[PDB]
């Protein structure tokens, strides 16, 4: 992920022009290769036409160039690219929203599962670790970065997501399916055992825990669904053919013909086809953005940081359920203990942001005295 | 379903061009027939015009070809295709989202329904089997692949979804409606009986089970709704007429007239109408993708694997409620038992994915000392 | 509703072309009248121009026809139709989703409300009948088909939705508003009475019932809202004027002028304006689809089958709460009682649908031994 | 609100053409003023050009008219109008959906809060009145019609939404913010007091009440948000400039120049610019619809009837919690008491709506005997 | 935020034209700089072409100007701007919806947490202060205005969001991550302690509190997600290049060439390129609106008032849980105590808003007596 929120906080002069200089995660990094191939092909063909064809062959080539340029506008490139890119961007944000975060579950585990002794610590750590293990199993199933970090369940055991006992249990349970759902059944059974043993004081708290864990299960299921049900191959194929056919045609149709022939549209020959190159930029960059976002769990620069998410989730969840359990800051009267209307101060930098409260759009409507009396 | 997520993980050079070689679930498999018919018609008409018409008839044909080519741009093909394809793709993903997965319910059944004895096993298996039977009844109602696998409720009994007792009960209950809703009433009644008999220890757990089962019922209802309320036939008819009328016109309007007459736009005759064929590719492929996705439960290559979903659900749900009930891995202190900040290792392949935590967009804003003091 | 899901299950050759022959719920049934009026007007005007105007009047008419044809492209017909049709289709599916189905509530009533005696039967039937009566009150308020079936609350009493006692109570309660909300207050009060009398064993079960009934109330409220807050009349007016103005202009602009004058674009005169008629098909059919879907509870062919929904809901809900209460099939061990991995059989027709499980997109990534070792 | 659902129930001949005659809430009412100003300006300029300019000045004016007409197509009017109108219509329906209805809460209050005595009546009326008072406080904040009805909290007291005691309490609580949230804290505290005093028998019922009231609070918050966070002024400004610039240009570019000069596109002069006026109709009517819907709580004809909603909510909620509390119709066996398959009758008008049940799309698939046998 | 809801309440004559005069938050404030640079460049180039080039150089410049003007229409500016602006405006409203409001939680805390003594006051204030502290931690992470107000956690302590004890606890807990999630674990633990100590009377009330707090946690997580996962830099880059390339081309292509040469499209030279400047207005204003909304938590005029939201939330939440706890207005019979149908009065200004109730669209359907009789 490349973050430029801080840069674009305000609408300054040339706000985006400044971002134009970024290289990492830039359109330049995606284009440069295809663009270099296109430029090489274009100039090879130009040199062929100028220095390797007879007069009759040059007449034939010029006829072909006028034909290609006249009929290129048939390809529905904007049509197909618009559809495809909208689908990919919608799916991309959905995929992000389905990334599971233990935070809600971890607060509820830290609260409800009771005991400062070894058994209480072990139970809390085990429940939150089951949540993290479920998440990491689905992530290594759908994400190339995570898979390269944990190319096997033995790697999961060596990295402390999974104990050797859990590894043996998973091996015993093995079906010909992705076993990412197992930790959720383990969580349900361990929560029930905790409640029966009096560590969870009430079935309403047990239900709360199970609801949070089941929300995580639904998110993991959505990740698996997006990973499995790709955007139809047929759509991908059609968009690829649209863009490539358009620019293969441009290789001939955007040749600068001999100015002598004075062909309409070829009066001026600039050796560099500026507008053809700009269209390459737009259309091929549009498709390459789609290529980069179609699987956000790849290793692109703008792909999600699944590895970081995994490490952060493990650290935060273990801290929340172990060190932060019944470990609260001293509860003392606050700054505004007997101040009916607290007014926190503003710094010099933020003093201009002090606003009068918005009271509703109807506040400033003025009516006559006669307009206000109720009628019988 | 054709999955190419792994291929398109990163934004490599020619990432989609590589997918262009796929045949199974390809646009080529959908087009080749209609395209062959179109090509045969186009070349029959070209041979008629060149080798079977007098001079006067050729003048009339050329007038007709100029008329057709001038006025083809009237058909709102992009207009109608865009609307129709957006509707079909939205409905396609919705239909996927309504596929019911027992996972949440199966974890709750495995937890809450108590007893390692025969009666406990039988009760758990029966409840999760009711969930699977409801799902398979709706799927055989809406899916041709599932229906071909289970062309009758007796097939359901022979395949172990339904016991002979359940078959007799369903036959007794028969109304002139789809009986897919019966297993949900059976589930409610059996859950209530389990609670009254003390196998479910608390009404809050009973409510949790019923909520999960009712979510599954809503998903099945949405499947039935999508199967029943087709995209309006009138929209389907209008899009079909748009595409077919456009290409029937192209058969005449995209003839290459005699270059001798030097008709504007007909200066160069390539025997093969490259741009007409490319538009065929785009527009007819667009409509054929819509044809393939309009019912995702058909037997197309890109259609959903409902049979696989059914088999996986049965195996996983029965395992979860029977073998995995109160069968947990040994609970032992984890790798990070006294490590305040766990740091799972990275492999050589994934070492580059180790990132610094994102701390918020405002992190790097620098202010003067004077800018920070609170004002009174 | 016209259903063609079964026909379009697969992407066969001419899949939609086959649907083109449907008459009932077809675009032809919607167009034929307006199309006949348009054709009559067009040919009246053509005969006027050819056989009732002097030479000077024909020059004036030809000038008018060139003017109309040159400036018709000003009307933003595609602009306005796209917007309007998208709004109507979105609202159409929303209206469907707001159709209330008793299924969830009926399973919960059949479960929780206890007693095989007369009083238990009467209580269960009364609660589910209140759900159905609320639904049918809103449906007769918003649906012309339902209203024609039940033109009065006395019809509701004669048809067995409403008892004479309920009719008297409703008459006593009468306010100057739609009384469709009354059965929900009745349901709440009767559920509370059932709980206080011990027929509902627990307040958690009472809360479950009330949540299901309140979901039904929200759906009914959405139906009432869609029925009340029409698409703004101004949008309807603008789209109607767009389409009618476009084709009124076409009556003059799409005349075939005298070929003798050799007016550009009028070289060839086909007595039948094929492209004008095709545009009529597309644009007027687009608007007529909008006309048909704007109120899906009308009596069109593609309108919802509200009457069928009402009858099915009553039959199914009464069966579920009365005959199916604590009436379960014999609970016996299933086919896979001691089969760790059940494998339901495939028929000859479905054998090709047996797939290998999808294991995740990262499954087939191969790494070197060196790429896998954890780094310190 | 203008309702024409009943008119457009079916897809009749000229279904929308009939609506074209509506005046109230019509596009005519919105346009007539701006259209009259535009027509006056256009004909003033035409009379200037024809009767107040020399020959040289007329040559200059004709050059200007050709320039304006050639380059008007630069303004992206359809671009900007499409975006703006889509945003306004989405926000308009959202604003409707956020209108709070007490129905769910009122059924739960009528059920759960117990007692037919004076104290029970007073408690139920007070709780539902707190719900209505919260709603009316937010509505008078966001709606000009409601504000004109209740220009002060003293008006709220005189109209019976607020008691003098509540008015004093609100005055004591006054902060420099909209106090619309106060009744929700009052509701929470009074519900807790009712539960502690035994009027609400169970904390699960207390939680149900609080959830319904908190849903209402979220809806009120969304209303306040839409009222506060307007569509960006910059978007409003850009759309206004687009439309006005387009038609200011049309005043000159759509002049009918002297037919003598025989300027291309000016061969025929109709004194009335039909297509310019039709574009005025479409584009300015599009913007005026946006103007009318941008604040749906104004006093336009198509604006919401907030006053009616307020009055209906008060009447219905007070009836539901006071007269309808434990006041049920006599519970007697229904018409279908021992009819296993009820079949409610159809009238002569609705007999054609009797349908055969939809059994699923796969119902009519026929397979050979050999196609059905399970394979080993 | 700039609010003009009150102004645009009705569809008056020139409703938006009146808003055109606004400066603060206007399109003028965003454009004036870029527009001045563009105008300076355009007129520098015009003066170069008119007063610094030979005749041959002027022929070359005119050829270049015709080339640029002919081929500018290649840049897909409307294509790319439409996509980008739709994404930014959808994100913008989502970001608003994720702003957390304590209202629901504060009503539940004020209700459920019991005790008018010092310990009860302290517990209620602490819980609601944890909610506010979590919100302000996320807001100072994602918002430049909030960060400038609280450039450090010590500023948070000085402003009364955080006690010194909480500051020490946070410092002890410090991980290499944003610690905004800590107050939610603190809230869970303090709620559990309150329940165990009998201040919260029931675990169902404890579950209600935790659900409200967890909703707030999800909203804060969404804010963090939007702040972290920017719109892809590649999209931003492509849109910026589209707009800048288009207007850099316009600097040459929209020169008014010498009228003497009588170049087509250059017959009339107005020194000011009105349509080029209008396109600048539209396209650059479109992009600048996107620049302003891409981060709504910046310091733009149309950016959210996060500081005001923070101050209002603190004041309201502390009032609700401290002064308003078990402090209800006297419960007395209302105005309509024995009025079966309350009819609140209308003022003179609002008398026209008294409407007849909407009874459903089917109300006015008239049927014959024969049409109504049920058939057997
Ligand atoms: N003949 C032409 C060749 C190339 C270009 C261009 O730069 O896009 C324009 C015209
Ligand atoms: N006259 C023509 C016939 C066919 C084509 C084409 O290849 O699309 C172009 C021109
Ligand atoms: N002058 C014309 C009249 C009619 C048509 C047509 O068929 O659409 C085309 C040209
Ligand atoms: N020169 C013209 C003036 C006006 C119109 C028109 O009616 O739209 C058309 C051409
Ligand atoms: N040659 C031209 C230069 C500028 C303009 C314009 O004002 O947009 C139009 C034509
Ligand atoms: Ca990627
Ligand atoms: Ca299919
Ligand atoms: Ca209809
Ligand atoms: Ca309004
Ligand atoms: Ca900003």
mmCIF file with all atom_site columns, C-alpha atoms in Angstrom, chain E residues 83-171:
data_model
loop_
_atom_site.group_PDB
_atom_site.id
_atom_site.type_symbol
_atom_site.label_atom_id
_atom_site.label_alt_id
_atom_site.label_comp_id
_atom_site.label_asym_id
_atom_site.label_entity_id
_atom_site.label_seq_id
_atom_site.pdbx_PDB_ins_code
_atom_site.Cartn_x
_atom_site.Cartn_y
_atom_site.Cartn_z
_atom_site.occupancy
_atom_site.B_iso_or_equiv
_atom_site.pdbx_formal_charge
_atom_site.auth_seq_id
_atom_site.auth_comp_id
_atom_site.auth_asym_id
_atom_site.auth_atom_id
_atom_site.pdbx_PDB_model_num
ATOM 1  C CA . UNK E 1 83  ? -14.403 7.411  -12.806 1.00 0.00 ? 83  UNK E CA 1
ATOM 2  C CA . UNK E 1 84  ? -12.086 9.203  -10.378 1.00 0.00 ? 84  UNK E CA 1
ATOM 3  C CA . UNK E 1 85  ? -14.677 11.704 -9.081  1.00 0.00 ? 85  UNK E CA 1
ATOM 4  C CA . UNK E 1 86  ? -17.294 8.965  -8.527  1.00 0.00 ? 86  UNK E CA 1
ATOM 5  C CA . UNK E 1 87  ? -14.754 6.986  -6.461  1.00 0.00 ? 87  UNK E CA 1
ATOM 6  C CA . UNK E 1 88  ? -13.722 10.048 -4.413  1.00 0.00 ? 88  UNK E CA 1
ATOM 7  C CA . UNK E 1 89  ? -17.346 11.145 -3.660  1.00 0.00 ? 89  UNK E CA 1
ATOM 8  C CA . UNK E 1 90  ? -18.426 7.597  -2.665  1.00 0.00 ? 90  UNK E CA 1
ATOM 9  C CA . UNK E 1 91  ? -15.343 7.390  -0.381  1.00 0.00 ? 91  UNK E CA 1
ATOM 10 C CA . UNK E 1 92  ? -16.130 10.884 1.011   1.00 0.00 ? 92  UNK E CA 1
ATOM 11 C CA . UNK E 1 93  ? -19.622 10.016 2.176   1.00 0.00 ? 93  UNK E CA 1
ATOM 12 C CA . UNK E 1 94  ? -18.396 6.669  3.574   1.00 0.00 ? 94  UNK E CA 1
ATOM 13 C CA . UNK E 1 95  ? -15.753 8.548  5.580   1.00 0.00 ? 95  UNK E CA 1
ATOM 14 C CA . UNK E 1 96  ? -18.463 10.779 6.978   1.00 0.00 ? 96  UNK E CA 1
ATOM 15 C CA . UNK E 1 97  ? -20.665 7.780  7.913   1.00 0.00 ? 97  UNK E CA 1
ATOM 16 C CA . UNK E 1 98  ? -17.706 6.277  9.830   1.00 0.00 ? 98  UNK E CA 1
ATOM 17 C CA . UNK E 1 99  ? -17.456 9.315  12.147  1.00 0.00 ? 99  UNK E CA 1
ATOM 18 C CA . UNK E 1 100 ? -18.325 7.865  15.568  1.00 0.00 ? 100 UNK E CA 1
ATOM 19 C CA . UNK E 1 101 ? -21.039 9.493  17.735  1.00 0.00 ? 101 UNK E CA 1
ATOM 20 C CA . UNK E 1 102 ? -21.310 8.464  21.402  1.00 0.00 ? 102 UNK E CA 1
ATOM 21 C CA . UNK E 1 103 ? -25.131 9.090  21.563  1.00 0.00 ? 103 UNK E CA 1
ATOM 22 C CA . UNK E 1 104 ? -26.365 5.458  21.610  1.00 0.00 ? 104 UNK E CA 1
ATOM 23 C CA . UNK E 1 105 ? -23.632 4.346  24.016  1.00 0.00 ? 105 UNK E CA 1
ATOM 24 C CA . UNK E 1 106 ? -24.134 7.412  26.234  1.00 0.00 ? 106 UNK E CA 1
ATOM 25 C CA . UNK E 1 107 ? -27.883 6.763  26.619  1.00 0.00 ? 107 UNK E CA 1
ATOM 26 C CA . UNK E 1 108 ? -27.139 3.128  27.567  1.00 0.00 ? 108 UNK E CA 1
ATOM 27 C CA . UNK E 1 109 ? -24.380 4.141  30.046  1.00 0.00 ? 109 UNK E CA 1
ATOM 28 C CA . UNK E 1 110 ? -26.659 6.802  31.642  1.00 0.00 ? 110 UNK E CA 1
ATOM 29 C CA . UNK E 1 111 ? -29.378 4.133  31.990  1.00 0.00 ? 111 UNK E CA 1
ATOM 30 C CA . UNK E 1 112 ? -27.641 0.917  32.978  1.00 0.00 ? 112 UNK E CA 1
ATOM 31 C CA . UNK E 1 113 ? -24.692 2.034  35.130  1.00 0.00 ? 113 UNK E CA 1
ATOM 32 C CA . UNK E 1 114 ? -26.327 2.658  38.507  1.00 0.00 ? 114 UNK E CA 1
ATOM 33 C CA . UNK E 1 115 ? -25.592 4.940  41.468  1.00 0.00 ? 115 UNK E CA 1
ATOM 34 C CA . UNK E 1 116 ? -26.013 8.623  42.293  1.00 0.00 ? 116 UNK E CA 1
ATOM 35 C CA . UNK E 1 117 ? -22.965 8.482  44.615  1.00 0.00 ? 117 UNK E CA 1
ATOM 36 C CA . UNK E 1 118 ? -19.367 9.517  43.809  1.00 0.00 ? 118 UNK E CA 1
ATOM 37 C CA . UNK E 1 119 ? -18.345 5.991  42.715  1.00 0.00 ? 119 UNK E CA 1
ATOM 38 C CA . UNK E 1 120 ? -21.316 5.741  40.294  1.00 0.00 ? 120 UNK E CA 1
ATOM 39 C CA . UNK E 1 121 ? -20.579 9.199  38.845  1.00 0.00 ? 121 UNK E CA 1
ATOM 40 C CA . UNK E 1 122 ? -16.891 8.318  38.448  1.00 0.00 ? 122 UNK E CA 1
ATOM 41 C CA . UNK E 1 123 ? -17.672 4.966  36.761  1.00 0.00 ? 123 UNK E CA 1
ATOM 42 C CA . UNK E 1 124 ? -20.140 6.526  34.272  1.00 0.00 ? 124 UNK E CA 1
ATOM 43 C CA . UNK E 1 125 ? -17.795 9.414  33.445  1.00 0.00 ? 125 UNK E CA 1
ATOM 44 C CA . UNK E 1 126 ? -14.876 7.008  33.006  1.00 0.00 ? 126 UNK E CA 1
ATOM 45 C CA . UNK E 1 127 ? -16.777 4.715  30.604  1.00 0.00 ? 127 UNK E CA 1
ATOM 46 C CA . UNK E 1 128 ? -18.056 7.527  28.371  1.00 0.00 ? 128 UNK E CA 1
ATOM 47 C CA . UNK E 1 129 ? -14.585 9.200  28.551  1.00 0.00 ? 129 UNK E CA 1
ATOM 48 C CA . UNK E 1 130 ? -13.018 5.952  27.280  1.00 0.00 ? 130 UNK E CA 1
ATOM 49 C CA . UNK E 1 131 ? -15.409 6.119  24.303  1.00 0.00 ? 131 UNK E CA 1
ATOM 50 C CA . UNK E 1 132 ? -14.434 9.760  23.617  1.00 0.00 ? 132 UNK E CA 1
ATOM 51 C CA . UNK E 1 133 ? -10.680 9.032  24.099  1.00 0.00 ? 133 UNK E CA 1
ATOM 52 C CA . UNK E 1 134 ? -10.804 6.156  21.565  1.00 0.00 ? 134 UNK E CA 1
ATOM 53 C CA . UNK E 1 135 ? -12.563 8.424  19.071  1.00 0.00 ? 135 UNK E CA 1
ATOM 54 C CA . UNK E 1 136 ? -10.098 11.315 19.593  1.00 0.00 ? 136 UNK E CA 1
ATOM 55 C CA . UNK E 1 137 ? -7.059  8.987  19.271  1.00 0.00 ? 137 UNK E CA 1
ATOM 56 C CA . UNK E 1 138 ? -8.281  7.767  15.865  1.00 0.00 ? 138 UNK E CA 1
ATOM 57 C CA . UNK E 1 139 ? -9.248  11.320 14.810  1.00 0.00 ? 139 UNK E CA 1
ATOM 58 C CA . UNK E 1 140 ? -5.828  12.768 15.666  1.00 0.00 ? 140 UNK E CA 1
ATOM 59 C CA . UNK E 1 141 ? -4.346  9.856  13.662  1.00 0.00 ? 141 UNK E CA 1
ATOM 60 C CA . UNK E 1 142 ? -6.419  10.585 10.519  1.00 0.00 ? 142 UNK E CA 1
ATOM 61 C CA . UNK E 1 143 ? -7.221  14.382 10.709  1.00 0.00 ? 143 UNK E CA 1
ATOM 62 C CA . UNK E 1 144 ? -4.746  17.278 10.281  1.00 0.00 ? 144 UNK E CA 1
ATOM 63 C CA . UNK E 1 145 ? -7.046  19.743 12.108  1.00 0.00 ? 145 UNK E CA 1
ATOM 64 C CA . UNK E 1 146 ? -7.351  17.419 15.144  1.00 0.00 ? 146 UNK E CA 1
ATOM 65 C CA . UNK E 1 147 ? -3.618  16.657 15.043  1.00 0.00 ? 147 UNK E CA 1
ATOM 66 C CA . UNK E 1 148 ? -2.776  20.389 15.054  1.00 0.00 ? 148 UNK E CA 1
ATOM 67 C CA . UNK E 1 149 ? -5.064  20.789 18.074  1.00 0.00 ? 149 UNK E CA 1
ATOM 68 C CA . UNK E 1 150 ? -3.513  17.773 19.908  1.00 0.00 ? 150 UNK E CA 1
ATOM 69 C CA . UNK E 1 151 ? 0.018   17.343 18.517  1.00 0.00 ? 151 UNK E CA 1
ATOM 70 C CA . UNK E 1 152 ? 0.808   14.946 21.433  1.00 0.00 ? 152 UNK E CA 1
ATOM 71 C CA . UNK E 1 153 ? -0.789  12.655 24.025  1.00 0.00 ? 153 UNK E CA 1
ATOM 72 C CA . UNK E 1 154 ? 0.450   15.159 26.603  1.00 0.00 ? 154 UNK E CA 1
ATOM 73 C CA . UNK E 1 155 ? -1.792  17.702 24.831  1.00 0.00 ? 155 UNK E CA 1
ATOM 74 C CA . UNK E 1 156 ? -4.596  15.122 25.213  1.00 0.00 ? 156 UNK E CA 1
ATOM 75 C CA . UNK E 1 157 ? -3.846  15.029 28.972  1.00 0.00 ? 157 UNK E CA 1
ATOM 76 C CA . UNK E 1 158 ? -3.708  18.858 29.224  1.00 0.00 ? 158 UNK E CA 1
ATOM 77 C CA . UNK E 1 159 ? -7.072  19.125 27.376  1.00 0.00 ? 159 UNK E CA 1
ATOM 78 C CA . UNK E 1 160 ? -8.828  16.640 29.767  1.00 0.00 ? 160 UNK E CA 1
ATOM 79 C CA . UNK E 1 161 ? -9.377  13.725 27.320  1.00 0.00 ? 161 UNK E CA 1
ATOM 80 C CA . UNK E 1 162 ? -6.796  11.618 29.152  1.00 0.00 ? 162 UNK E CA 1
ATOM 81 C CA . UNK E 1 163 ? -5.754  11.518 32.802  1.00 0.00 ? 163 UNK E CA 1
ATOM 82 C CA . UNK E 1 164 ? -2.076  11.272 33.770  1.00 0.00 ? 164 UNK E CA 1
ATOM 83 C CA . UNK E 1 165 ? -2.768  7.697  34.993  1.00 0.00 ? 165 UNK E CA 1
ATOM 84 C CA . UNK E 1 166 ? -4.124  6.771  31.533  1.00 0.00 ? 166 UNK E CA 1
ATOM 85 C CA . UNK E 1 167 ? -1.079  8.434  29.928  1.00 0.00 ? 167 UNK E CA 1
ATOM 86 C CA . UNK E 1 168 ? 1.304   6.307  32.049  1.00 0.00 ? 168 UNK E CA 1
ATOM 87 C CA . UNK E 1 169 ? -0.709  3.146  31.244  1.00 0.00 ? 169 UNK E CA 1
ATOM 88 C CA . UNK E 1 170 ? -0.610  3.917  27.493  1.00 0.00 ? 170 UNK E CA 1
ATOM 89 C CA . UNK E 1 171 ? 3.165   4.551  27.691  1.00 0.00 ? 171 UNK E CA 1
#
